[PDB]
Amino acid sequence: VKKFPEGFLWGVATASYQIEGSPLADGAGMSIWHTFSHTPGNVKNGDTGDVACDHYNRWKEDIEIIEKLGVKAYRFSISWPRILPEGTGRVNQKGLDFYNRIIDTLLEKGITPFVTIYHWDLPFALQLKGGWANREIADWFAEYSRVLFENFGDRVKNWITLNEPWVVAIVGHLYGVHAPGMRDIYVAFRAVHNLLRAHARAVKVFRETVKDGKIGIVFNNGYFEPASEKEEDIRAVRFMHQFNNYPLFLNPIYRGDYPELVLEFAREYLPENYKDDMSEIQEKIDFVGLNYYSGHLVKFDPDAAKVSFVERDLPKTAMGWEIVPEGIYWILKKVKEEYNPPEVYITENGAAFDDVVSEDGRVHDQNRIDYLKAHIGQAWKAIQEGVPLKGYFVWSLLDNFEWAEGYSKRFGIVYVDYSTQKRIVKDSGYWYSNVVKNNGLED
């Protein structure tokens, strides 16, 4: 048996664009995901968030499923352009109303809300003004955040500024695979820097507006292992960890500069006097959220950021991602070793598999159970070794719009039949309910 600490938080997570649908309802402005997904070629099958899980209408029934499963924390995001259709200026009361109903219902049911302020659905109106490339986004994001704090901070006490700023910056502005779909390395590093500035401004106003609250920030992480003992491969691993994982943002937040290998690689792409902003970027945070899915074997490659991945014969998910549960232990140990944050959450962990509804009307996803069990066990090991891990959130409550992969990839512990919008709790859902009941793993 592996019992967690008594106050441990077990949650499920979603994001607004992935589940809500009705992106233009009730006065909402377009987001960059609306325009990106409506551009032919950008998303598999031409899928969009126009309907998704229809959570905009079905939110009450989905919360009843959270209650049914016995889960006591729900991490969800707020759509910026539902709240401020033009990004700044006009506040849309019906956008506030939508989230107020969710928040009030969660509290009535004793489910703790964790609110992600930004999970990639930037207002299109702000992208026309450069989006994350524009230094002024620190002001725009501070404005938006203040609206949320003033409206919701009486009830919501646990907040996240940004989901995965690395992905926002690099995947959105260097690889061009996510909205706003750009390929410019100078823009991408200015986005990294503005994301830190925006985050820090939001925390600063949080201290004025939610004096009894806690605020943090969420990073994607992978477990990188070297293909050989060659110094060049060891160094390539170090680079991937400093660039792709939490240090890109936590070295600034905790130490006041970007990590060594990031500076070596990218100093020419950063704003000239970027260091002027580092004093503000050090604004104190209450917790760090780490997302974790997969591991990669890495090699130096002069033809590649000089790093290529080496495919391994390891079990994989429907995303093609290698299943390496020890990486969740490694990343937790490493965050403590490097930055010693006072509190850490696993803010996403999960897996996509090819789910089907059998004749019994059930969804038998033993592969998803095995995945979640292995990673939860490794998280438990990290706790035994002193990592201040305070909670774990499964990605996701619901099958949903998987960004550029569209609806083809199912990460839910609840299946969604998109023709009828019927929800079917998967075996992993029943499994996880039992994990919450036992406060850990029982065999």
Ligand SMILES: OC[C@H]1N/C(=N\O)[C@H](O)[C@@H](O)[C@@H]1O
């Ligand atoms: O790719 C799965 C999941 N993983 C994520 N980050 O690693 C995103 O936050 C989330 O929106 C996405 O659906």
Ligand SMILES: [Ca+2]
């Ligand atoms: Ca109920």
Ligand SMILES: [Ca+2]
């Ligand atoms: Ca300064």
